[PDB]
Curated annotation (Swiss-Prot):
Keywords: Acyltransferase, Antibiotic biosynthesis, Peroxisome, Transferase, Zymogen
Highest taxon of the lineage: Eukaryota
Lineage of origin: Eukaryota, Fungi, Dikarya, Ascomycota, Pezizomycotina
Major location category of this protein: other
Protein name: Isopenicillin-N N-acyltransferase
Amino acid sequence: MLHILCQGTPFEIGYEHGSAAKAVIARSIDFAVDLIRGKTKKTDEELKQVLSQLGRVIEERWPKYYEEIRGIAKGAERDVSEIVMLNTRTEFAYGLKAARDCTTAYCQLPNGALQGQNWDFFSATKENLIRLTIRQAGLPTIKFITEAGIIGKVGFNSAGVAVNYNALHLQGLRPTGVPSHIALRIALESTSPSQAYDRIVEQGGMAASAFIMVGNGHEAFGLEFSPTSIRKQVLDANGRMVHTNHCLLQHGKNEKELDPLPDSWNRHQRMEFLLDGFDGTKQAFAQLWADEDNYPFSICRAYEEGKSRGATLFNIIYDHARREATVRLGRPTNPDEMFVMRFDEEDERSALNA
Ligand SMILES: [Cl-]
């Protein structure tokens, strides 16, 4: 997969991403514009002004992330508004829908915890997946998988913090709140899961709804959130956490879950069942993600026109003991490719500002 090493100032980091992924980012934009236009009767000009407002929020609240976004825009030869769109796509789409009218697991194990997910979405975005290695002096070096143009998604850092992301649709939008991809980047820049939690909560509230899991070898948590709820999932009695695309946690009375898919319950039940028979081995853990019970709506999801709109587009497994992450692109039943990510001495020197 296209793998871009980004280092220096936030702007330089963004510029390297934007330049090397220029063609892919053009595709990401084309896809996002199509998605957005399907959600609304609003004119393009009006949408551009909404993007300007959201851009002003990011500029004020997270200057360093905004500078990176400006760099991506410059390198990809696109407007900042287009890159802002990419980085707030879920929120932007939720907002437009409201105006108009993934499977993840962590297992604590004595010989080394395992954590992973399948990411399921519209197949057209699979060809837009890239990976970034980001080195910033004095921060953990980050290695993550993302649709090109986006600054935080699913991956891990040199401090051992590993993150996963699942769609979740609780009602509510706060355009001044922290976007979910900014929260992912905040987590990826933290030195421990507890610091990630503290730093996410520090922002003082979420812009929309999602689920994020943060773990290392020692501890992990899940967060189900809306602009009016931040609830923590913790390990169960078997040392496991499983999350799909619906609320598992107790939320405030006014919280409202919007059109979750029936298979979200099915996959959660299925993964819990599969973990009951799981022997703890890395080989066995990897095989869980290729499960096809209730195909095409399975843990290893398939596109089937008229039935299932999306597919599993990649799988990632964090071997916490070794600080390695194995990525399988496409469906784990027959991956398009497979590679292992790990940190080197230079990744560690950047993190120590040495
Ligand atoms: Cl637009």
